[PDB]
């Protein structure tokens, strides 16, 4: 299985003219394109090795289309400010997430299209890609005119069509980076917190994709009391890292064993302090 | 690639 996603962000700057627009594209957990309305290049720019090979007609099309959207978002900030009867002098954020998924067979699984106003659900295209779901009355207005215009047919055309066409292309073009699973480089560190206690911290470094499961076991049995996971943080080199810590009584370190599960690993790992 | 700019906006 694989996935493609684009994330548009549009924020109003009342007093400092034109709203700022930012767009970024991901294949699985790998960013490959970006556009910024404030950036002087005024062009969609590459953010991965395997997209740089695309010709200038690609970069002009992407630029022209993603700029056209920013101009719509700019008017839609006005529209929604009207709908909700909000202050003229208020920064507001229209985020748009859309993209498609392909199975192991390389065939379409499902598509997404979701809009949010000030970081709360506004309107979402349903899984059948022929019907919408509004979050409040303002979005119910948008829903109606989008039903009347048959806007859903546009989104479906992309998600079932040119989304999967170009997702397949990317997953091939850069298969060496995108289909490559880097397994986690694991170790365990000891931190005495008193003369009758200690903190065992189970590390996992430089793994792709970010999907991972760290779990503590005491004498074979699952142990989550005093466990403390942290959000899967990016290494900033394409790879990810995450550690799970547990507080143990002094001189019982052997009993506690950390278990790492990752797509990159054929068999799940088992660690233990010495 | 990106989706074409929304025909009718919100």
């Amino acid at each position: 299985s694989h996935s493609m996603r684009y994330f548009y962000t549009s924020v109003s700057r009342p007093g400092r003219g034109e709203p700022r627009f930012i767009a970024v594209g991901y294949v699985d957990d790998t960013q490959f394109v970006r556009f910024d309305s404030d950036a002087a290049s005024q062009r969609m720019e590459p953010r991965a090795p395997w997209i740089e090979q695309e010709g200038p007609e690609y970069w002009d099309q992407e630029t022209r289309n993603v700029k056209a959207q920013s101009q719509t978002d700019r008017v839609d900030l006005g529209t929604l400010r009207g709908y909700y009867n909000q202050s003229e002098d208020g920064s507001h954020t229209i985020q748009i997430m859309y993209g498609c998924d392909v199975g192991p067979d390389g065939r379409f699984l499902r598509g997404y299209r979701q809009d949010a106003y000030d970081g709360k659900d506004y309107i979402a295209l349903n899984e059948d890609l022929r019907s919408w779901t509004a979050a409040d009355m303002a979005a119910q207005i948008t829903k109606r005119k989008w039903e009347a215009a048959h806007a859903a047919e546009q989104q479906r055309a992309y998600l079932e069509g040119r989304c999967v066409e170009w997702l397949r292309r990317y997953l091939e073009n850069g298969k060496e980076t995108l289909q490559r699973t880097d397994p986690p480089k694991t170790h365990m560190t000891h931190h005495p917190i008193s003369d009758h206690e200690a903190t065992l911290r189970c590390w996992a470094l430089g793994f792709y994709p970010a999907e991972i499961t760290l779990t503590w076991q005491r004498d074979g049995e699952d142990q989550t009391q005093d466990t403390e996971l942290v959000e899967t943080r990016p290494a900033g080199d394409g790879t990810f890292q995450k550690w799970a810590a547990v507080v143990v009584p002094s001189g019982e370190e052997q009993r506690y064993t950390c278990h790492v599960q990752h797509e990159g690993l054929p068999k799940p790992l088992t660690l233990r302090w010495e | 690639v990106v989706v074409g700019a929304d025909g009718v906006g919100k």
Partner: T-cell receptor, first 116, second 116 residues
Framework: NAGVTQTPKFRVLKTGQSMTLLCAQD?????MYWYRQDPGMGLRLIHY???????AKGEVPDGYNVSRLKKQNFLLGLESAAPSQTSVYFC??????????????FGNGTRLTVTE | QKVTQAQTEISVVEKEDVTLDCVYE???????LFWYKQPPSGELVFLIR??????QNEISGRYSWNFQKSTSSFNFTITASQVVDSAVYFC??????????????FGKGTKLSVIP
């Protein structure tokens, strides 16, 4: 809503005289255009404007100039009238980015003649 | 971005079928196609808009539009010609500009002459 009004219906000019074609729309449209229809050629864009304040050169801007003063009104200026500029002129408007798939709404057209 | 209406003038017998050819040419992936009617009077009348994605065939009374994405054409056929169908018909193509604002280029137009 009236749509795209435009004046005058007809007008004659001496070569070198000045005149301003007048167009207004009450549909609160962002885009506004000034086209030029002639036998053999199509609809050739002289000048356009993508919102109040700003304008831009089209296909055949030479000999013309435009004023997007407020949203409603888009003006077309002939400083020095040339026999060339003897044509039919249409004002037009489109909703704007809010509705990208919007068609052009045209005015009822001005017929201009410019004799020596 | 380019639009070609092959035929300059096309006369036809009254109550005979007639097809107004329009071949377009763009690198744009999301675009909108238009047909406009200009009767002798002079006004430009919006007939239909086609989205780049939607199905090829549509039937609206005596009017019918075949949209062949693969041949890159959008042909307009009038079955059982009424004398009132006599007009200059225009084909147009809207795509995003460098600014991120959909502007459209028109064909040179086809003149239909429905002889009773």
């Amino acid at each position: 809503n009236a749509g795209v009004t435009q004046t005058p219906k007809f007008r004659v000019l001496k070569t070198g005289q000045s005149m301003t074609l007048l167009c207004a729309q009450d549909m609160n449209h962002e885009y506004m255009y000034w086209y030029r229809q002639d036998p053999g050629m199509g609809l050739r864009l002289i000048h356009y404007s993508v919102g109040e304040g700003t304008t831009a050169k089209g296909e055949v801007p030479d000999g013309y100039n435009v004023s997007r003063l407020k949203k409603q009104n888009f003006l077309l200026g002939l400083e020095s009238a040339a026999p060339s500029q003897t044509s039919v002129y249409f004002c037009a408007s489109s909703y704007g980015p809010g509705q990208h798939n919007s068609p052009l709404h045209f005015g009822n057209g001005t017929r201009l003649t410019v004799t020596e | 971005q380019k639009v070609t209406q092959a035929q300059t003038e096309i006369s036809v017998v009254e109550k005979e079928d007639v097809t107004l050819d329009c071949v377009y040419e763009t690198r744009d992936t999301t675009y909108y196609l238009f047909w406009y009617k200009q009767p002798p009077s002079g006004e430009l009348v919006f007939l239909i808009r086609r989205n780049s994605f939607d199905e090829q065939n549509e039937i609206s009374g005596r009017y019918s539009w075949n949209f062949q994405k693969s041949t890159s054409s959008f042909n307009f056929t009038i079955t059982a010609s009424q004398v009132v169908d006599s007009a200059v018909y225009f084909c147009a193509l809207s795509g995003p500009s460098g600014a991120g604002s959909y502007q459209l280029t028109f064909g040179k137009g086809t003149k239909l002459s429905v002889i009773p």
